[PDB]
Amino acid sequence: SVALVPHVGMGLETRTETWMSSEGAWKHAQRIETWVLRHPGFTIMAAILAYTIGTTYFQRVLIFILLTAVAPSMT
Amino acid sequence: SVALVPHVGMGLETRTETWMSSEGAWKHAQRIETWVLRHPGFTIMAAILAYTIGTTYFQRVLIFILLTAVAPSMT
Amino acid sequence: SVALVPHVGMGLETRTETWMSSEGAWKHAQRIETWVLRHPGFTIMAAILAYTIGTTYFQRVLIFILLTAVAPSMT
Amino acid sequence: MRCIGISNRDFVEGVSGGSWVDIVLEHGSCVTTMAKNKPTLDFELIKTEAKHPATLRKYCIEAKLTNTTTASRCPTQGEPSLNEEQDKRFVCKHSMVDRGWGNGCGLFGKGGIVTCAMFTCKKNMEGKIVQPENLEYTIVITPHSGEENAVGNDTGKHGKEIKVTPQSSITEAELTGYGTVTMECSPRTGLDFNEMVLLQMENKAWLVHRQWFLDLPLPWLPGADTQGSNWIQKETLVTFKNPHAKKQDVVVLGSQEGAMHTALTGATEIQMSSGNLLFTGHLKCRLRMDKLQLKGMSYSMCTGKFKVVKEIAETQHGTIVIRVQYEGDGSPCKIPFEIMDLEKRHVLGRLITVNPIVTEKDSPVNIEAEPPFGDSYIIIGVEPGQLKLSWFKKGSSIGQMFETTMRGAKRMAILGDTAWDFGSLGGVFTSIGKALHQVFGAIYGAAFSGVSWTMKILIGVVITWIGMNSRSTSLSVSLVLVGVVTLYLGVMVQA
Amino acid sequence: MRCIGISNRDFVEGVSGGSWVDIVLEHGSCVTTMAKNKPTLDFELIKTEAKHPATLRKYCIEAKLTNTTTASRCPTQGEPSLNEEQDKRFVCKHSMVDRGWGNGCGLFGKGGIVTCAMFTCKKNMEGKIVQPENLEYTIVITPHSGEENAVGNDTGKHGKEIKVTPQSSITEAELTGYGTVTMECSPRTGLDFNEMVLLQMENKAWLVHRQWFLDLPLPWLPGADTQGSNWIQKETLVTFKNPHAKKQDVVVLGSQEGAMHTALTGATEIQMSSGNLLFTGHLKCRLRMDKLQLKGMSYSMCTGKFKVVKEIAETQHGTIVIRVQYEGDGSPCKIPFEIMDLEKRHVLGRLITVNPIVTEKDSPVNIEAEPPFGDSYIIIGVEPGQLKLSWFKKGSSIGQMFETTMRGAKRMAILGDTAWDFGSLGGVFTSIGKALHQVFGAIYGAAFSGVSWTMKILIGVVITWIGMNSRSTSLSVSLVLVGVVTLYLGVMVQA
Amino acid sequence: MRCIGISNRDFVEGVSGGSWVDIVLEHGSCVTTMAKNKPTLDFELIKTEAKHPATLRKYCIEAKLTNTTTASRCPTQGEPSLNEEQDKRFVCKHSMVDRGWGNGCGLFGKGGIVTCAMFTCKKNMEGKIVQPENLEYTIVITPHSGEENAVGNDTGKHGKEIKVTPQSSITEAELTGYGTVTMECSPRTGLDFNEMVLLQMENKAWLVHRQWFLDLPLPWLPGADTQGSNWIQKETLVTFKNPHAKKQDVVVLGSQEGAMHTALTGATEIQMSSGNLLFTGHLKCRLRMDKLQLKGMSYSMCTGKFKVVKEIAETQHGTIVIRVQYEGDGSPCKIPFEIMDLEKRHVLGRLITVNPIVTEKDSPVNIEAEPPFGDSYIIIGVEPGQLKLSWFKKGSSIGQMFETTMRGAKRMAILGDTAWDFGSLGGVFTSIGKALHQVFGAIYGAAFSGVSWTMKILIGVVITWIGMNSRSTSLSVSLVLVGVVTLYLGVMVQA
Ligand SMILES: *[C@@H]1O[C@H](CO)[C@@H](O[C@@H]2O[C@H](CO)[C@@H](O)[C@H](O)[C@H]2NC(C)=O)[C@H](O)[C@H]1NC(C)=O
Ligand SMILES: *[C@@H]1O[C@H](CO)[C@@H](O[C@@H]2O[C@H](CO)[C@@H](O)[C@H](O)[C@H]2NC(C)=O)[C@H](O)[C@H]1NC(C)=O
Ligand SMILES: *[C@@H]1O[C@H](CO)[C@@H](O[C@@H]2O[C@H](CO)[C@@H](O)[C@H](O)[C@H]2NC(C)=O)[C@H](O)[C@H]1NC(C)=O
Ligand SMILES: *[C@@H]1O[C@H](CO)[C@@H](O)[C@H](O)[C@H]1NC(C)=O
Ligand SMILES: *[C@@H]1O[C@H](CO)[C@@H](O)[C@H](O)[C@H]1NC(C)=O
Ligand SMILES: *[C@@H]1O[C@H](CO)[C@@H](O)[C@H](O)[C@H]1NC(C)=O
C-alpha cells in the first residue's frame, strides 16, 4: 500500500515543517510499543534468542532491539 | 495509519482464504527489495556495520538481515 | 493537596517577613517529632537498617536521619 | 454424494465401541464417513450464523471539519481561549506563533495559539460482538444413495440439512430409508466468538481479533452512544499545520477506507450484510451411527444385465465413480459390484458407495469405489452378462502415505488441538496426544503471536541453526525439531 | 529626620569623584547619607506599585457539583455513553462495577460505568502578571532639617516624594533650601516581575513565583477566558467513589482556601485590592550629591541660651537625638553644637544633623549626633547659659565592628550580589567582588533552589563534615567554608 | 524592518572586495545585513512560483469495478479465455476451481477460471512536473528606515519586491533614498526541480521526490491520456478472492486518499490552486552593496527633545526596538542615540537601525539597537531634555556563543553545502570548507538516503560505540565524530 512508503528520508527537507511531522515523528515508536505490550510472548523469545546468539552484551542488545523492531514491522 | 497494523498473526486463520492473502503475501518482501534497490547506499553501510559488530558469520549475517529489514519498514 | 507544595525555596525572599514564616519555621520538625512519638516501631527498624547498611558511622547516622525524615514525608 | 468433486475431502473409517465417531467439520470441506454395515454418509458444514449481535464500538473512517476558529495571546500572557474548546465535537490544538509589534502585540516572542474545528463523521466502521450462544451452525448430511444427480449436486432434494445450536446438543435427522443420524456437536468450542468482533465497513464485513479491533488508531465511539458526535480519538484523523511558525491550520486528513482494507489483510471476510452469515471456521461433532440403516439391505441381488451410462472418472483422491443402469427385472435389487485383480482372484478395491442398489429400473445409479493402485477390474453384474471393466490407478502406496501425512500435518496446522479428534475413536493415545498438543500449542501461540510468516521462517531458521550447533544432543534435537516445525508453520501460515 | 527610630537603618557615608554614591533602598529598611560639605538626607522606598496587570491564570479553590448522572453497560460490550460527556463543563470518570442477572444485565462480569456531574466554580484565585516597564517606585527624601516633630515622622510634608519609573533613568527632586537631589535608581534589576505572579485570593494577595504558580494542582482557567466555565484538570477538586464496586459516585472535595494558605507559606503578602501596590523588595539607586547644598550657611551663630525640651535619647544605632529650645534674639541663626570631652580640649562627636539651625524662635530643634564610645559631653550655646550635657555610649569599637560585619553579612544573604552595590563608589575591589559574588550566587541558587531551611542546615553540616574529613588541605578548607556559608544562609533564611 | 519579530531572523555583518556578500534566503527566515557604511536591509524570500506545469503521471486513489464476467474450463482443458482479457480497461485474474460431474464437467479436477471486471477511476492525483527555468522567486527588500509602521510589518508599501528567474538571475532594486541594491541570485542551484514532482491530490498539494512518485504502488495513466481508459497497475486497487476453490470474484479496494496522506508524511505541503505556489526551500543570492548608500547622512544632529511613544521591547534575538517621536526644531535631522553605561563613559552596544533620522517632525521613528548583556542605558537626544532609558539584557556571552553555534549547526544540517555560502565573503577557508562538506555530504546522502530518523539515531549510536571501543585512536576519533554528527542529524531531522 502507499501508506508503507512514507517518503521520509528522501532529503529535500527544508526549515518549513513537513506534512504530518509531529505525528509521523513518533507513530512508529508508539506502534512498536503497543505491539510489544500486546505480544509479551514474542518479546521474551526475542530476548532469549538475542542472549544466545550474541556474545558481547552490546551485540545481544543490538540483536534484541533489531528483532523487536522488525517483528511488528513485517506485520 | 491503520495500514501499519495489519491483521496478520492474530491466530484466527482457518482453511478459508483470508482477505488479500494472495494479493499481499509477498508485498513486504517486494517492498524491502524495492527499497534496497533504490537505496543501495544504506545497504552497504549496514553490511559493513554488521561485519564489524558480528564476531561470527551467523551473527553478522543475522544483524545485516535485521537492519536491512527494519530500515524500510521503519521508514 | 496544594498545601504539599509550599512556596518555600523559590528565592524571592526579602527582608520583609513572609506570609507564615514564624508558624511554618518549625512545623515540619514538630510534625516529625510527633510522628516518631506515635510510631516508635518504625524508628527502631530504621535505626537497625541504618546500622546494617552504612559502614561508616557518619553514613549510618545519615541514612537513619533520612529514613526517619522521609517516613512521615511520604505519608 | 455431495462430497464427490471437492478437493478438501476427508474419509473417516470405522466407529468406536458404541458406534460413534467424532469429526471436525470445516467450511469448504466435507467429511465422508463409512463403517462396517453402515451407509456411507457425507457431512458438510455449509453455513454459520450469528444472531442478535451487539455493537462494541464504532470507528470513523471519513470525516469533515467545519467552523474553524483561531485565537492567540501575547507572549508570557498565558494561553488563548476559545468558547469552542468546551465542546467535545471540536478538535482543538495549542501551538506557539511568533508575535510582535508587527502582529499587533506589544511584546516580542512566541505567543500561544489555539485552533478549533468541528469534527463531523461521514462514514462509520461498526464493530459488533455476538455471544457464543447465538450461533446457528447449519450442516448437510448426504447419504451415498447412488442417485443419478447426487454425484456432486450441491442443491437440495438429495441430503438432509440440520441446524446445530448451543441450546440443544443432540441434533437428529431422519434420512429417508437410512434411519436416523444423531450428531453431538460442540458449537461453543468451535470459534471464540467472545474473543472476536464482526467488523463491518460499508458493504463488506470481516471477522477480526477483538483486541486488534480495539487497538485501531481511529476516532471511535463506545457503541452505546445515541448521539454519535463525541468521537474520542478525533486527532487521529485530523492534521494541525504550523508551516512557518506564524499561523496554525487544520485539515480533515482524507479517507481511511483504503488503509482499513490494507490493515484487514489476514482477516477472513464474512457476509454481515443480512444476518451475519459466516462461511469460515469448523465444528467438532460426535456422529452416532447406532440408528443408521443400510438403504438396500434386505434386497435380492440383481441378476440382469448392467450397462455403463457414464464412464469411470477418477477423483482427486483416487476414488473412481461410475454411473450404470439396470436392464433386468426384479428392479428393487442391489448391484453386484466388485473390484478384482487382473486374474479375478482377489477383491482388491474398497467400495465407498457401501451398498449399491437399483431403486428404479430406468434410473442410473452412481457408484464410487477405491480401486487399488495399478491394474484393476471393475466387475458389475452377474456372470452371464457382467461388465468387467479395466481401470488403472496411477500412484503408489508410499505416495498415498506421504500425501496422507501432509494432509494430517496441514490439518493440525489449521486446527491445532481440535485436529486430534477429527477421526478419533476415543483412545488413550488420542487423549495423550491432544493434551501434549494443547500444552505445546499454548506455548507456541504465546511465543509467536502477531508475527508474520516471514518472521516465523526467520525465527525457525535461527532456532534450527542454534540446535545444529549445540553441544548437548538432548537440547539440539529439541531445538532443531522446534525450528523445523516453525519453518513448516511459516510456510503454511497466512493462507 | 524620618529615619530615626527604625530598626533597619544604614549609614551611607562619603561620595566619589563626581559626587555620587550607590545605595540599595529596601521597603522595611532606611538609609541616611552623609558627605562633606553636604546636608544629611534620609531615604525610604515607601511603596512599589505594579500597573496594568494582565491575568495569567485563574485557579479554582471551591467548586460544586450538580446534575449528576450515571450510565453503564454489560460486561464485554464496551464502554457506556452519556450525552453529558459531550460537554467539558461536566467532570466524568469511567470505572467498572460487577454486573449480572440482578443488575438487569444478561451475563456476569465487570461492567463499565460512567459518572458525570456539572463542575461549577464559586471561588477562584486569580494570578496577575505585570510588565517591568509598568512598575512605579515611590521614594521619600527627607533632609535632617531638625524641625519640630520631624523625628521618625511618617505622615509627610517633611520630605519630597519622588516617583521612579523605568521610563526615565534620572529622577530629580527639589528640596527647598538644599538644592536638587538626583537619583538614578534601576527598577529593572530590582525584582523580576516577568518571573513572578501577583496572586490574589479573596481579600489577600501574594507575590509568588511564576513557575510555582503554574505548577499548582488545582482546576484552572487560561486567564484569557471570558466565559469562565471551561475549567482544566477539574479532577483535582472532585473525587469519585467506588467503595465495593457496585456503583460509582462523584463528590466535591471542599474549599481549598486553607490548603492554599498553607501552600503560600514563604510567599510575601501584598495589597492587590484597590491597586496592585506591593511593599516588598529593594531598589538600587545612584544618588548624586552635586547641586546639593546646606541650608542656612549664611546665618550667623545663635548668641542666646538654649533650653532642653526633650532629654537626650539614644537610637538603636548609637546616634543620640536631642531637642532644644532657643530663647535669644536673631532667631534664624545656627545652633552652636559640638561633642567634646570633659575638658573640651578636642571634639569627639560627629554631628549627623549637619548645620543645625533655628528658623523660628518658638520651633524646637531636635539635632541628632553620633557620640563616641564612652563618656562625652554635648555642648550647646555660648558661654553665658551654655549647656554641657553628659552622655555614656556604653559600647566598644570592636563591638560595633562585629555588629556591622554581621549586618553586612545579613545584607549579602538578603540582597545577594546587590549587597556589593550598597554604599559603593565604583572601586575596583567592589566590582571584582561583585562579579565573584554573581558567579558564586548563581551556582548556589542553582544548587539550593526549592529546599527548606532544614535541608539547608543538613546540606551545610554534611558538606562541612566532608570538607573537614578530606585529605587535601585545600579542598578541606574550601568545603568547610562552603558548608559554613550554607549553614549561615539556612539559619538566616525564611525571613 | 520586516525582519523584526521573526524567530528565524539572522544577521549578516561585513562585506568583501566589491562590497558583496553571499546570503541564503529561506521562506520562513528573514535576513538582516549590516555593513560599515551601508544601510541595514531586511531580506525575505516571500514567494516561489512554478509556471506551466506538465503532468507526469495520474494515479487512481479511488476506483469502481463493473461489468464483471467469468469463464471456466474443465480440469484438464487448459486455461480459459475471455474477450475482455485483451481489453486494457478490464482487470482480469486467473485461478482454479474444483470441478467435476456436479459442476457439469464430466471429469474431476482443478479446472481453471478467469474473471474480469471493468476498472473506472473516480478520484486521481496529478503528479505535475515543472521545468527549472519556469520557477520565479519573489524577494522583498526593506531598509531599516525607522518608519513607525515598518517594524515586523508585512502588509506592504514599505520595501521593494524583486522577482528573480533563472533566465534573469541578476536584478536591481531601487530603494528610494538608500541607493540601489543588486542581487546576483543562483536559483538553479537551489531545489533541483528536474528531480521533484508537484503532487496535487484534490485541493491539497505536496512537493515530492520524483522517483518516489514514480515508485508509488497505484494504477496510473501516462499523464497525456484524455480518455483514462488504460490504467497501468489496476492490480493494486482490486482484490480477487477465491475463499473456497468453488467460486472466484473481484472487489475493488477503498479510497486511498487516507493512505496517501500517511504516505506523504515528510513531504512539504505546497499550494497548487491558482498557481503552483511553493512556500518551501531556499535561495542563494549575492548581495552587491556598491551602489547602496545611507539616507540623510548629510543632515545635522537634531538638538531637540524626544518622547517615547513605544516602550523598549526586546526581541527574540537580544536586540531592542523603541519608537521615539521628535518634538524639536530642525526636522530632517539625525537622531542622537547611544547605548552607554550608567556614567555615560563607555559605549556598550551598537544600533542596528544605522543612521536613525527624523524625516518628518510629526512621524514617530523606531530604532533597533543591540545592547550589551549587563545593564545598559539607551540615551536619546542632547543634553537639554535628554532621555536616558534603562535596560537589562538577560543572556550571557557564553550563552550567545553556543546559541549561535547551535544555529549555525542547524543551518548546516538543513542547507548542507549551501550553509557555507550564508555569510561567505569569497574566502579560502570558506571554499575549502564548502568543498570538504560537498564531498562528505555526497557520501552521507548516498549512505543515509531513505532512512528514518530513529534508524539514523540507531546507526549513529552503533558507529559512536564502535569508535568508543577501538584499538586505533585515529579511526576511533573519526568514528566517534561521525557517530556524534549522525546522532545530531537524527535528532534534528523531520523539520
Ligand atoms: C441437482 O438435483 C436437481 C433435482 O432437485 C436437478 O434438477 C432436476 O433436473 C431434472 C433434469 O432436468 C428435472 O427433471 C427435475 O425437474 C429437476 N428438479 C429440480 C428440483 O430442479 C439438478 O439438475 C441437479 N444438478 C445437477 C448438476 O445434476
Ligand atoms: C508628624 O508630622 C505631622 C505634621 O507635621 C504632625 O501633625 C501635626 O500635629 C500637630 C499637633 O496636633 C498639629 O498642630 C499640626 O497641625 C499637625 N500637622 C499636620 C500637617 O497635620 C504630627 O504630630 C507629627 N507626628 C510626630 C509623632 O511627630
Ligand atoms: C504596515 O504598513 C501599512 C502602510 O503601508 C499600514 O497601513 C496604514 O497604517 C496606518 C497606521 O495607523 C493607518 O493610518 C493607515 O490607514 C493604514 N493604511 C494605509 C494605506 O496607510 C499598516 O497598519 C502597517 N502594519 C501594521 C501592523 O501596523
Ligand atoms: C457553525 O457555523 C454555522 C454557520 O457558519 C453556525 O450556524 C453554527 O451555529 C456554528 N456552530 C458552532 C458550534 O460553532
Ligand atoms: C440541573 O438540575 C436542575 C434541577 O432540576 C435543573 O433545573 C437544571 O436545568 C439542570 N441543568 C442541567 C444542565 O442538567
Ligand atoms: C458493460 O455493461 C453495460 C450495462 O448495460 C453495457 O451497456 C456495456 O455494453 C458493457 N460493456 C462491456 C461489456 O464492455
CA dist., res. F6 & res. F13, Å (int): 18
Q: Looking at the CA of E118, name the nearest ligand.
A: 5
Inform me whether the C-beta atom of residue A5 falls under 8 Å from chain B C-beta atoms. yes
Q: Which helix (H) or strand (E) holds F212?
A: helix F210-214
**DSSP for F26-75?**
ESS-EEEEE-SSSPPEEEEEEEEEE-S-EEEEEEEEEEEEEEEEEEE--T
CA dist., res. D289 & res. D38, Å (int): 7
Gyration radius of chain B over CA positions: 16
Inform me whether the C-beta atom of residue D279 falls under 8 Å from chain A C-beta atoms. no
Residue with cell 511553493: F278
Inform me whether the C-beta atom of residue B73 falls under 8 Å from chain F C-beta atoms. no
Inter-chain touch F455–B71, beta carbons under 8 Å: yes
CB D375, CB D63: distance < 8 Å: no
Give the three-class secondary structure for F307. strand
Is the beta carbon of F262 within 6 A of some atom in ligand 3?
no
Is the beta carbon of F471 within 6 A of some atom in ligand 3?
no
Neighbours of F249 (CB within 10 A): 15
**Chain Cα centroid distance, residue D387:** 44
Give residue B39's identity as a one-letter amino acid code: H
CA-closest candidate to residue D371, choices D400, D341, D345, D399: D341
Q: Where are the domains of chain D?
A: 300-395
The CATH number that domain F306-392 falls under is 2.60.40.350
Burial (CB < 10 A; 0-12, 13-18, 19+), residue F449, is middle
Is the beta carbon of E363 within 6 A of some atom in ligand 2?
no
Question: How many residues would you count in chain F?
Answer: 495
CA dist., res. D366 & res. D147, Å (int): 6
Residue of E nearest to D53 (CA): E77
User: Which of chain B's residues have a Cβ under 8 Å away from the Cβ of A8?
Assistant: 75
Q: In the 8-state DSSP scheme, what is residue E202?
A: T
Whole-number Å distance, alpha carbon E146 to ligand 2 midpoint, is 15
CA dist., res. D162 & res. F279, Å (int): 69
Phi, psi angle pair for C61, to nearest 5°: -65, -40
To the nearest 10°, the Cα dihedral for E79, E83, E87, E91? -50
Residue of F nearest to D252 (CA): F258
Inter-chain touch F449–B41, beta carbons under 8 Å: yes
CB A49, CB D460: distance < 8 Å: no
**Would the CA dihedral through D81, D86, D90, D92 be positive or negative?**
positive
The region that residue D275 occupies, defined by phi over 0 for left and psi between -120 and 50 for alpha, beta otherwise, is: left
Give the three-class secondary structure for F480. helix
What Cα–Cα distance (Å) separates residue F196 from each residue in A11, A13, A19, C7, F210?
Answer: 11, 12, 16, 58, 5
CA-closest candidate to residue D276, choices D445, D126, D388, D71: D126
Helices of type H across E123-255:
187-190, 210-214
Neighbours of E339 (CB within 10 A): 20
Spell out which residues line ligand 1, taking CB within 6 angstroms: D 149, 153, 155, 157; F 102, 104
CA dist., res. D372 & res. E188, Å (int): 108
CB D54, CB D33: distance < 8 Å: no
Inter-chain touch A23–F281, beta carbons under 8 Å: no
Give the pairing type, strands E10-13 and E31-35.
parallel
Cell numbers describing residue F79:
486455461
- Report yes or no on chains F and A touching (3+ CB pairs under 8 A): yes
Residue A70: which of B54, B70, B75 has the nearest Cβ? B70
The shortest C-alpha distance from F217 to chain A (Å) reads 6
The region that residue F303 occupies, defined by phi over 0 for left and psi between -120 and 50 for alpha, beta otherwise, is: left
CB E39, CB E292: distance < 8 Å: yes
Residue with cell 526475542: A46
Whole-number Å distance, alpha carbon E358 to ligand 2 midpoint, is 19
CA-closest candidate to residue E250, choices E119, E116, E120, E122: E116
How many helical (H) and strand (E) elements, i.e. helices and strands, does chain D have? 7, 29
Residue with cell 489476514: D266
Phi, psi angle pair for D26, to nearest 5°: -80, 160
Whole-number Å distance, alpha carbon F154 to ligand 3 midpoint, is 10
CB D343, CB D133: distance < 8 Å: no
Which atom of ligand 3 is nearest the CA belonging to F156? 5
Buried-exposed string D225-236: b where 16+ CB fall within 10 A, e elsewhere = beeeebbbebbb
The shortest C-alpha distance from B67 to chain D (Å) reads 14
**Would the CA dihedral through F295, F299, F301, F303 be positive or negative?**
negative
Cell numbers describing residue F136:
520565479
Cell numbers describing residue C45:
527498624
**Regarding the domain delimited by D300-395, which CATH topology (the fold level of the hierarchy) does it fall under?**
Immunoglobulin-like (2.60.40)
CA dist., res. E73 & res. E92, Å (int): 16
**Chain Cα centroid distance, residue D55:** 23
Buried-exposed string D34-72: b where 16+ CB fall within 10 A, e elsewhere = bbeebbbbbbbbbbbbbeebbbbbbbbbbbebeebbbbb
Residue E167: which of F308, F375, F392 has the nearest Cβ? F308
E55-125+208-265: what CATH class? alpha beta
Whole-number Å distance, alpha carbon E67 to ligand 5 midpoint, is 6
Neighbours of F297 (CB within 10 A): 12
CB F82, CB F69: distance < 8 Å: yes
CB F393, CB F370: distance < 8 Å: no
What Cα–Cα distance (Å) separates residue B3 from each residue in A36, D220, D265, E239, F127?
Answer: 18, 17, 9, 40, 23
**Chain Cα centroid distance, residue F139:** 15
Farthest CA pair distance, chain E: 118
Inform me whether the C-beta atom of residue B1 falls under 8 Å from chain A C-beta atoms. yes
CA dist., res. A24 & res. A18, Å (int): 10
CA-closest candidate to residue D40, choices D7, D18, D22, D13: D13
**Structural domain of residue C21, as residue ranges?**
1-72
Whole-number Å distance, alpha carbon D102 to ligand 3 midpoint, is 11
Is the beta carbon of E36 within 6 A of some atom in ligand 2?
no
Phi, psi angle pair for D183, to nearest 5°: -125, 135
- What's the angle, vertex CA D479, arms to CA D478 and CA D480, rounded to 5? 95
Cell numbers describing residue F159:
520595501
CA dist., res. E363 & res. F374, Å (int): 50
CA-closest candidate to residue D127, choices D192, D222, D36: D222
The shortest C-alpha distance from F244 to chain B (Å) reads 6
Reported resolution, Å: 3.2
Residue of D nearest to F1 (CA): D102
What Cα–Cα distance (Å) separates residue F438 from each residue in D480, E378, F441, F442?
Answer: 52, 89, 5, 6
The shortest C-alpha distance from D430 to chain E (Å) reads 35
**Chain Cα centroid distance, residue B43:** 13
Cell numbers describing residue D203:
458493504
**DSSP for D443-486?**
HHHHHTTT--HHHHHHHHHHHHHHHHT-S-HHHHHHHHHHHHHH
Cell numbers describing residue E467:
570538607
- Report yes or no on chains F and D touching (3+ CB pairs under 8 A): yes
Buried-exposed string E464-474: b where 16+ CB fall within 10 A, e elsewhere = bebbeeeeeee
User: Which of chain B's residues have a Cβ under 8 Å away from the Cβ of D452?
Assistant: 8-9, 28
CA dist., res. D44 & res. B15, Å (int): 14
Residue with cell 481561549: D81
The shortest C-alpha distance from D472 to chain F (Å) reads 34
Whole-number Å distance, alpha carbon E113 to ligand 5 midpoint, is 22
Helix B40-53 to helix A57-74 angle (10° resolution) is 140
Give the three-class secondary structure for E433. helix
**Would the CA dihedral through F132, F133, F135, F136 be positive or negative?**
positive
CA-closest candidate to residue D37, choices D334, D297, D425, D288: D297
CB E456, CB E489: distance < 8 Å: yes
CB D42, CB D64: distance < 8 Å: no
Residue with cell 477421526: D423
CA dist., res. B34 & res. B46, Å (int): 16
Residue with cell 442477572: E101
User: Who contacts E16 (Cβ-Cβ below 8 Å, separation ≥6)?
Assistant: E425, E426
Give the three-class secondary structure for B61. helix
CA-closest candidate to residue F117, choices F164, F54, F67: F67
In chain E, residues 437-456 whose CB comes closer than 8 Å to chain C: 445, 448-454
E strand intervals along B1-75: none
The shortest C-alpha distance from D186 to chain A (Å) reads 29
Residue E280: which of C16, C21, C65 has the nearest Cβ? C16
Helices of type H across E298-427:
397-415
Farthest CA pair distance, chain A: 46
Cell numbers describing residue E165:
519609573
Q: In the 8-state DSSP scheme, what is residue E424?
A: B
CB D389, CB D369: distance < 8 Å: no
Helix B57-74 to helix A57-74 angle (10° resolution) is 40
CB E23, CB E422: distance < 8 Å: yes
Long-range CB pairs of D469-477 (<8 Å, 24+ gap) are none
CB D240, CB D248: distance < 8 Å: yes
The shortest C-alpha distance from F314 to chain D (Å) reads 6
In chain C, residues 2-61 whose CB comes closer than 8 Å to chain E: 2-21, 23-25, 28-29, 58
- Report yes or no on chains B and C touching (3+ CB pairs under 8 A): no
How many helical (H) and strand (E) elements, i.e. helices and strands, does chain F have? 6, 28
- Count the alpha carbons within 13 Å of F7 in the hemisphere toward its beta carbon: 13
Neighbours of F345 (CB within 10 A): 7
User: Who contacts F177 (Cβ-Cβ below 8 Å, separation ≥6)?
Assistant: F145, F295, F296
Q: Which residue has the CA at smallest separation from atom 2 of ligand 5?
A: E67
Whole-number Å distance, alpha carbon F66 to ligand 6 midpoint, is 9
Cell numbers describing residue C71:
517516613
The region that residue D158 occupies, defined by phi over 0 for left and psi between -120 and 50 for alpha, beta otherwise, is: alpha
User: Who contacts E298 (Cβ-Cβ below 8 Å, separation ≥6)?
Assistant: none
Q: Which residue has the CA at smallest separation from atom 13 of ligand 2?
A: E149
- Cα-Cα end-to-end distance for chain E: 28
User: Who contacts D366 (Cβ-Cβ below 8 Å, separation ≥6)?
Assistant: D1, D4, D146, D147, D148, D150, D151, D321, D322, D323, D353
Q: Looking at the CA of D155, name the nearest ligand.
A: 1
CA dist., res. A42 & res. E44, Å (int): 75
Burial (CB < 10 A; 0-12, 13-18, 19+), residue E345, is exposed
CB B74, CB A73: distance < 8 Å: yes
- Cα-Cα end-to-end distance for chain B: 13
Neighbours of F383 (CB within 10 A): 7
Q: Which helix (H) or strand (E) holds F445?
A: helix F428-448
Number of domains in chain C: 1
Give residue D144's identity as a one-letter amino acid code: H
Residue with cell 481401470: D391
CA dist., res. F227 & res. E63, Å (int): 68
- Indicate which of C1, C15, C22 best probes the interface with E, i.e. most E CBs within 10 Å of its own CB: C15
CB E65, CB E251: distance < 8 Å: yes
What Cα–Cα distance (Å) separates residue D36 from each residue in D178, D184, D359, E263, F230?
Answer: 14, 21, 22, 91, 63
CB F98, CB F248: distance < 8 Å: no
What Cα–Cα distance (Å) separates residue F410 from each residue in F417, F452, F491?
Answer: 12, 18, 11
Q: In the 8-state DSSP scheme, what is residue D236?
A: G
Helix D473-492 to helix D453-468 angle (10° resolution) is 160
Helix A40-53 to helix D453-468 angle (10° resolution) is 40
Helices of type H across E62-207:
187-190
Residue of A nearest to B66 (CA): A66
E strand intervals along D186-282: 196-201, 204-209, 220-221, 239-241, 249-251, 268-270, 277-278
What Cα–Cα distance (Å) separates residue F84 from each residue in F68, F72, F91, F233?
Answer: 10, 14, 8, 16
Give the pairing type, strands D284-288 and D179-185.
antiparallel
Residue B2: which of D29, D218, D462 has the nearest Cβ? D218
CA dist., res. F473 & res. F480, Å (int): 10
CB F277, CB F47: distance < 8 Å: yes
CB pairs under 8 A between D and E: 85
Q: Which helix (H) or strand (E) holds C65?
A: helix C57-74
Inter-chain touch E169–F388, beta carbons under 8 Å: yes
**Chain Cα centroid distance, residue E50:** 14
Q: What is the 3-state secondary structure (H, E, C) of D175-196?
A: ECCCEEEEEEECHHHHCCCCCE
Phi, psi angle pair for E86, to nearest 5°: -65, -35
Give the three-class secondary structure for E45. strand
Residue with cell 553665658: E384
Cell numbers describing residue F461:
549510536
Inter-chain touch D242–A17, beta carbons under 8 Å: yes
